[PDB]
């Protein structure tokens, strides 16, 4: 019984920023979601369509573990049908999403005293995101009637702004490592159960 690599999307060294969330296609193994929830090292865990009491019984073909890091009051935005700042320009879940987020507070290993400017988040965009879409771009957001040719001066602002992460903030703004688990079905034979 070979365990699925959930040791590389939970206990990893560093996560990616929310504008460049890395999608890990976990397949050809046997999961044990139970471990996570049950030992409760982790915290919030909310699903729709599936539930953890029905998780280890029925199985899927490809589970998508999408890991990112956000702020404290922005964990509420990683939810179906939610609008805001992260949920409209960084990471939008579809209305028929069938997986659960797992968010645990990470002030011990992710925030540095006097500034952690290594995590970015998108603040402006020309339009909202389609579900499960990632835009890695640094093109300067035109918010005026003047075509700017790359310099971020007046009314032409840089799209990615930096998270500041001081240890001392608040549950309100501490770094929260968030990984979703998008389950889906195909014509391919289902692998991830046991």
């Amino acid at each position: 019984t070979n365990l699925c690599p959930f040791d590389e999307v939970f206990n990893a060294t560093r996560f990616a920023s929310v504008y460049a969330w890395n999608r890990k296609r976990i397949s050809n193994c046997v999961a044990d979601y139970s471990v996570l929830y049950n030992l409760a090292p982790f915290f919030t865990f909310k699903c729709y369509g599936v539930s953890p009491t029905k998780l280890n019984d029925l199985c899927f073909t490809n589970v998508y573990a999408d890991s990112f890091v956000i702020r404290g009051d922005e964990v509420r935005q990683i939810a179906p049908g939610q609008t805001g700042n992260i949920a409209d320009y960084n990471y939008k879940l579809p209305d028929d999403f069938t997986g659960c987020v797992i968010a645990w507070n990470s002030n011990k290993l992710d925030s540095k005293v006097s500034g952690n400017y290594n995590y970015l988040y998108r603040l402006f965009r020309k339009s909202n995101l389609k579900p499960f879409e990632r835009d890695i771009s640094t093109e300067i957001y035109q918010a005026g009637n003047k075509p700017c040719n790359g310099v971020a001066g007046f009314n032409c602002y840089f799209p990615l702004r930096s998270y500041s992460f001081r240890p001392t903030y608040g549950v309100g703004h501490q770094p929260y490592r968030v990984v979703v688990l998008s389950f889906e079905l195909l014509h391919a034979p289902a692998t991830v159960c046991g």
Binding site: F124, A143, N145, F154, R161, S164, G170, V171, H173
Partner: protein
């Protein structure tokens, strides 16, 4: 593609960015008020101009969006606090003169070096000195030197130095399309654009003049009682028909009358309510002062304190190896961090400010969801008023009955709360004309109502008509008598202390009517009643996004600033003050002079 959407994306940049550079500035200032160090004082000045030269680059970029077409009122009240050019409206050499003269009036007030020519061998510092001599000195001439010399060596060098200040701060306001600098202090009470709730700047002078006319018989009957109770202390120094002398009001200028309680006590045979000898016997520490200050706040419905509050704050003075300046200020560092800073001791007047200081935080914890330029009070006198009502309910004998401090069998007769209400009369009522007169003098020297040679004749005549105070020495125009204060010399608005009083009892009229209190106001306790917390949290979370005249209608039911709840707080005092004043003469005359020799 329109100016409303251009201002939303600019302010969305701004908030976020400001949060980063406001924390970085405020954390270096929190490390200065904990570790007074030469290495750490340059870190405050390096993080200070990085927010000052940031707000200068952001205000110029905020001036390209006109307010003539922005229609959403949240954006307009955000840009109104950013499109103000501030002190940068003048020229180069004229405005640097403003900055270098604030550093020579702030340093000359804190380091005023005055003493006596009779014995100049050993001299004085203001603290521990001239503030102590206004407390336990009951001599006439010994307090005359203590008050005249502070207005002859500190006010002397400010009188030709503040004439340049009034002609230079008018240029800071007449370039911002104001009438004078007096309209700039009145500009925070400005509300314009909302239907039915408008408030011009010129209506504030007519609103204080109508509220002061109603506390006129209340302050007068204190003045007929303080004068009658000072006749035995000084037999031939205070006339019964005249006004009070300046150098016997118990303070450095005459603002607060708290130090005049021990001479004019109504009932000294009964003990004053104190729990200082009750807290040390129960082994109460610095943590349990703020523990039970929180048990008042979670018991009204207001949110619990954050986990970062109990680990990053400073409550005990950390030894004699590092100096921590701990005059009690509540620090909003921003970004979810709400620390507190005071060297708290086990005394009652220290415990009573623990409820007041968390009221600054519980206000500031409520508008954390608001944008950054509106994370403030509804006006500049609104933050200090929402804190004092939390201290006003923690001083009642019914609240100390609950937390175990007071005795289980405690009597309370009709001669007990009169000694408590006079304690509140000498700190709140007696400062009400002294806040109005000093601000009426500032508004009538900024408007050009009195020139150079009349600059001080309409100060003591504003003293012996409004506050009932005659200065003992005939002063010429070479002294600037209001220049000897903390709030005049350091360039702060003073009308916030008048409006703090008329809000801190108007809110208590509204919360106690929601908490179902059957009795007078000074025995009311808003704790253990969550109906009054929700009537407060509907104002606490608004911040500056909603105007202040709708923050008052959301609580009390009146759009304006009323005065009848303050007079209703002192209703057992006003009845008792008329009972004892039959033998005295009410009112005063403008004729009496102690120097009429």
């Amino acid at each position: 593609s329109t100016i409303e959407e251009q201002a939303k994306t600019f302010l969305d940049k701004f908030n976020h960015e400001a949060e980063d550079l406001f924390y970085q500035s405020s954390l270096a200032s929190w490390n200065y008020n904990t570790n007074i160090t030469e290495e750490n004082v340059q870190n405050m000045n390096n993080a200070g101009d990085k927010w000052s030269a940031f707000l200068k680059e952001q205000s110029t970029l905020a001036q390209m969006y006109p307010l003539q077409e922005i229609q959403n009122l949240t954006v307009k009240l955000q840009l109104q606090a950013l499109q103000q050019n501030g002190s940068s409206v003048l020229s180069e050499d004229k405005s640097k003169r403003l900055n270098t003269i604030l550093n020579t009036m702030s340093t000359i007030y804190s380091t005023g070096k005055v003493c006596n020519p009779d014995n100049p061998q050993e001299c004085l510092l203001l603290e521990p000195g001239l503030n102590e001599i206004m407390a336990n000195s009951l001599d006439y001439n010994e307090r005359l030197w203590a008050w005249e010399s502070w207005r002859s060596e500190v006010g002397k060098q400010l009188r030709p130095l503040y004439e340049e200040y009034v002609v230079l701060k008018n240029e800071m306001a007449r370039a911002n399309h104001y009438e004078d600098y007096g309209d700039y202090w009145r500009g925070d009470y400005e509300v314009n654009g909302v239907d039915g709730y408008d408030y011009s700047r010129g209506q504030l002078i007519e609103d204080v003049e109508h509220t002061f006319e109603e506390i006129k018989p209340l302050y007068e009957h204190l003045h007929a009682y303080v004068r009658a109770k000072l006749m035995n202390a000084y037999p031939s120094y205070i006339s019964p028909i005249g006004c009070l002398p300046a150098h016997l009001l118990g303070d450095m200028w005459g603002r607060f009358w708290t130090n005049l309680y021990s001479l004019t006590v109504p009932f000294g045979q009964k003990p004053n309510i104190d729990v200082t000898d009750a807290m040390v016997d129960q082994a109460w520490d610095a943590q349990r002062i703020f523990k039970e200050a929180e048990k008042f706040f979670v018991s009204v419905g207001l949110p619990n304190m954050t986990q970062g509050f109990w680990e990053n704050s400073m409550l005990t003075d950390p030894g004699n190896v590092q100096k921590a300046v701990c005059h009690p200020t509540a620090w909003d560092l921003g970004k979810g961090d709400f620390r507190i800073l005071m060297c708290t001791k086990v005394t009652m007047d220290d415990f009573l400010t623990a409820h007041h200081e968390m009221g600054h935080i519980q206000y500031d914890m409520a508008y954390a969801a608001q944008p950054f330029l509106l994370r403030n009070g509804a006006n500049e006198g609104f933050h200090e008023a929402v804190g004092e009502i939390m201290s006003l309910s923690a001083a009642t004998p019914k609240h100390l009955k609950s937390i175990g401090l007071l005795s289980p069998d405690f009597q309370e007769d009709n001669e007990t709360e009169i000694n408590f209400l006079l304690k509140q009369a000498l700190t709140i009522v007696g400062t009400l004309p002294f806040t109005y007169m000093l601000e009426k003098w500032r508004w009538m020297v900024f408007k050009g109502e009195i020139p150079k040679d009349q600059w001080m004749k309409k100060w003591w005549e504003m003293k012996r008509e409004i506050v009932g105070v005659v200065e003992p020495v005939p002063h010429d125009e070479t002294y600037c008598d209001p220049a000897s204060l903390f709030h005049v010399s350091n360039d702060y608005s003073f009308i916030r202390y008048y409006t703090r009083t008329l809000y801190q009892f108007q809110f208590q009229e509204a919360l106690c009517q929601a908490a179902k209190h059957e009795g007078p106001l000074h025995k009311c306790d808003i704790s253990n009643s969550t109906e009054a917390g929700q009537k407060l949290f509907n104002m606490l979370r608004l911040g500056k996004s909603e105007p202040w005249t709708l923050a008052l209608e959301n609580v009390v039911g009146a759009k304006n600033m009323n005065v009848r709840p303050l007079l209703n707080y002192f209703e057992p005092l006003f009845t008792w003050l008329k009972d004892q004043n039959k033998n005295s003469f009410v009112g005063w005359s403008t004729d009496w002079s102690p120097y009429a020799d």
